[PDB]
Amino acid sequence: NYLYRLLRKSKLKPFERDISTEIYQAGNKPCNGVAGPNCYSPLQSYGFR
Amino acid sequence: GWIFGTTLDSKTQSLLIVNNATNVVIKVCEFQFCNDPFLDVY
């Protein structure tokens, strides 16, 4: 239930909250809503045990 | 009246500062305004 963001285009300003989830793209080929090659979901689970 | 933010309609939190006689409804969350945003009167 606890997730963190590890990929973004630029650094965050102070006291700035990012809520929206979009497929992160770091290449010339666009994701177009498909999490395929060179496309990663920015929200990752901590996995506490 | 004014609006602020990055996009409209959805997908991004958008500021809404509407003004009239007496109402300063301010809403971070979301409102439905099209590409020509105006407040209907009659």
From Swiss-Prot, chain B:
Domain of life per record: Viruses
Glycosylation sites: 20
Subunit annotation: Binds to host ACE2. RBD also interacts with the N-linked glycan on 'Asn-90' of ACE2. Cleavage of S generates a polybasic C-terminal sequence on S1 that binds to host Neuropilin-1 (NRP1) and Neuropilin-2 (NRP2) receptors. Interacts with host integrin alpha-5/beta-1 (ITGA5:ITGB1) and with ACE2 in complex with integrin alpha-5/beta-1 (ITGA5:ITGB1). May interact via cytoplasmic c-terminus with M protein. May interact (via N-terminus) with host bilirubin and biliverdin, thereby preventing antibody binding to the SARS-CoV-2 spike NTD via an allosteric mechanism.
Role: Attaches the virion to the cell membrane by interacting with host receptor, initiating the infection. The major receptor is host ACE2. When S2/S2' has been cleaved, binding to the receptor triggers direct fusion at the cell membrane. When S2/S2' has not been cleaved, binding to the receptor results in internalization of the virus by endocytosis using host TFRC and GRM2 and leading to fusion of the virion membrane with the host endosomal membrane. Alternatively, may use NRP1/NRP2 and integrin as entry receptors.
Protein name, UniProt field: Spike protein S1
Gene (name only): S
Residues of the full protein shown: 103 to 145 of 1273
